[PDB]
Amino acid sequence: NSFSGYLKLTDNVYIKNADIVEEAKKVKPTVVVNAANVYLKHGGGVAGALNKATNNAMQVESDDYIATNGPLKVGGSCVLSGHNLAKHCLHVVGPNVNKGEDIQLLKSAYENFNQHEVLLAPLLSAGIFGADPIHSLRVCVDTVRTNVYLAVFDKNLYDKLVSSFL
Numbered sequence: 001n002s003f004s005g006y007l008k009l010t011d012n013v014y015i016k017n018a019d020i021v022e023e024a025k026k027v028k029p030t031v032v033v034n035a036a037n038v039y040l041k042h043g044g045g046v047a048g049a050l051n052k053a054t055n056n057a058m059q060v061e062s063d064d065y066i067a068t069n070g071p072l073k074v075g076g077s078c079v080l081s082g083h084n085l086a087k088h089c090l091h092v093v094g095p096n097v098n099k100g101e102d103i104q105l106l107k108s109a110y111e112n113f114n115q116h117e118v119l120l121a122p123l124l125s126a127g128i129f130g131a132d133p134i135h136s137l138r139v140c141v142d143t144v145r146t147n148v149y150l151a152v153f154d155k156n157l158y159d160k161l162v163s164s165f166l
């Protein structure tokens with residue numbers, strides 16, 4: 001958890017313009033959050049990038065978790081190995097509002113972060129899930145009570161989030 005170069009937005013939310021894969025490889029945090037789907041199929045976005053950085057070890061483990069436990073619920077999570085990226089990966093399912101899933105479940109999704117004192121994470125439901133990323137940061141700030149270090153890849157999005165916040 002030796003994070004560096006973050007800007008503190010609130011007592012417990014920090015942000016950096018960084019690639020979450022590179023941050024995980026540098027810091028090897030106790031927990032890295034994945035922006036997952038209910039079947040843990042890590043096909044694109046942050047999920048595809050974290051799985052690729054494990055050379056598909058994350059996907060093989062996830063398929064076994066699903067065969068034994070069934071799919072997650074939207075707003076839910078599971079804890080699996082972080083492989084080379086972290087001690088643990090917290091796979092969290094935010095709603096895909098582009099498919100009619102309820103935006104209220106974004107609060108439920110962020111509540112899962114409270115089971116861990118420190119996390120490295122992306123914004124949930126941003127990208128292909130369709131939620132406005134600045135709304136997702138507001139829900140994170142209003143819901144997460146533990147220490148969360150948010151990595152945002154895109155510089156234009158990062159500058160917009162920092163300006164809206166501070």
Ligand SMILES: O=C(O)C1=C(c2ccc3ncccc3c2)CCC1
Binds near residue numbers: 126133153154
């Ligand atoms: O943080 C961003 O800029 C966002 C996304 C993203 C998408 C793909 C990524 N592939 C590798 C590492 C980080 C990634 C991050 C999806 C929406 C917002």
